[PDB]
């Protein structure tokens, strides 16, 4: 049924039109905190900000701001934190958020450099013996092991709160093969990655929300959240064909602006949900 809708949109060539309708219908809420002068260097892109109502607040005392939003999908029963790729001055804030929100997994959808442009800071350690200390937020981060596969890498990180000496294992799920331009021709590897994140236990409601990012935290990150949420809704709804991807995306857009940045990402999302549903 979704596949009938897909073939019809493809045949009529109206992805751009449907995508522009989503842009026009999307929620508009204030982002006053993100736009305060004191937060200018905490934002990677001046045009991508978290709404005040859904922003993640840091708990330490001087400035609570991080460019990150809680996407709480009530019907699907899953929450996600979508955030920009950390900046050189916000890596301590990023790991403070992971600690305070009790997240178990981090999903990264970009390479640190793509087409010779930096998309995010090197915010985790690449060598076991070269741990990172974030002196502003008093956290230590150590690479324990990594499992490098052809299309993604999963890293076992140890995050230590240096104040209390408590440690937690964080799983870093890094999809390394999104194309430099456009979307993947096939959703197969993206879906395999999505199911590996699920299989790891990182999305269990016993943990805090998974932290998802790319460079701005809206495009590829939106595709991941949209596909994961729609697949959940299909497994729960009495009639799985009732899941309307455009409606789900507009729901997500109540929590963070700009999710899904191109008509091609919208088409890819439909394609990933259709193929993933067959798998389940
Ligand atoms: Cl200010
Ligand atoms: Cl990388
Ligand atoms: Cl729906
Ligand atoms: Cl947009």
From Swiss-Prot:
Tissue specificity note:
Expressed in keratinocytes (at protein level).
A GO term for molecular function = RNA binding
Answer yes or no on keyword Hydrolase: yes
* Modified positions (Cysteine sulfinic acid (-SO2H)) in chain numbering: 214
Every copy of the Tyrosine-protein phosphatase domain together lies at 2-276
Q: What is its main location?
A: endoplasmic reticulum
Residues that bear Phosphoserine: 49, 241-242
Q: How does it sit in the membrane?
A: Peripheral membrane protein
Q: Which residues carry this modification: Phosphotyrosine?
A: 19, 65
Cellular component (GO) terms are: cytoplasm; cytoplasmic side of endoplasmic reticulum membrane; cytosol; early endosome; endoplasmic reticulum; endosome lumen; glutamatergic synapse; mitochondrial crista
Q: Could you provide one GO biological process annotation from this protein's UniProt record?
A: negative regulation of phosphatidylinositol 3-kinase/protein kinase B signal transduction
The UniProt PTM text for this protein says:
Oxidized on Cys-214; the Cys-SOH formed in response to redox signaling reacts with the alpha-amido of the following residue to form a sulfenamide cross-link, triggering a conformational change that inhibits substrate binding and activity. The active site can be restored by reduction. Ser-49 is the major site of phosphorylation as compared to Ser-241 and Ser-242. Activated by phosphorylation at Ser-49.
Protein name in UniProt:
Tyrosine-protein phosphatase non-receptor type 1
What does UniProt list as this organism's lineage? Eukaryota, Metazoa, Chordata, Craniata, Vertebrata
Gene name of the encoded protein: PTPN1
């Amino acid at each position: 049924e979704m596949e009938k809708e897909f073939e019809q949109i493809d045949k009529s060539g109206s992805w751009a039109a449907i995508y522009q309708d989503i842009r026009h219908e999307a929620s508009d809420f204030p982002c006053r905190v993100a736009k305060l002068p004191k937060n200018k260097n905490r934002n990677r892109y001046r045009d991508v900000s978290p709404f005040d109502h859904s922003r993640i607040k840091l708990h330490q005392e001087d400035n609570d701001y991080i460019n990150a939003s809680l996407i709480k999908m009530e019907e699907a029963q899953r929450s996600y934190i979508l955030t920009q790729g950390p900046l050189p001055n916000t890596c301590g804030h990023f790991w403070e958020m992971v600690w305070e929100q009790k997240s178990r997994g981090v999903v990264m959808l970009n390479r640190v450099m793509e087409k010779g442009s930096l998309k995010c800071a090197q915010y985790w350690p690449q060598k076991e013996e070269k741990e990172m200390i974030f002196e502003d937020t008093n956290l230590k981060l150590t690479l324990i092991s990594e499992d490098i596969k052809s299309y993604y890498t999963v890293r076992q990180l140890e995050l230590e709160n240096l104040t209390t000496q408590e440690t937690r294992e964080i799983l870093h799920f890094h999809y390394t093969t999104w194309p430099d331009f456009g979307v993947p021709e096939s959703p197969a590897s993206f879906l395999n990655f999505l199911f590996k994140v699920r299989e790891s236990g990182s999305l269990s409601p016993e943990h805090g929300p998974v932290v998802v990012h790319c460079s701005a935290g809206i495009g590829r990150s939106g595709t991941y959240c949209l596909a994961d949420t729609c697949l959940l809704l299909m497994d729960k709804r009495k009639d799985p064909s009732s899941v309307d991807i455009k409606k789900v995306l507009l729901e997500m857009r109540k929590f963070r602006m700009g999710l899904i940045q191109t008509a091609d990402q919208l088409r890819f999302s439909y394609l990933a949900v259709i193929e993933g549903a067959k798998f389940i």
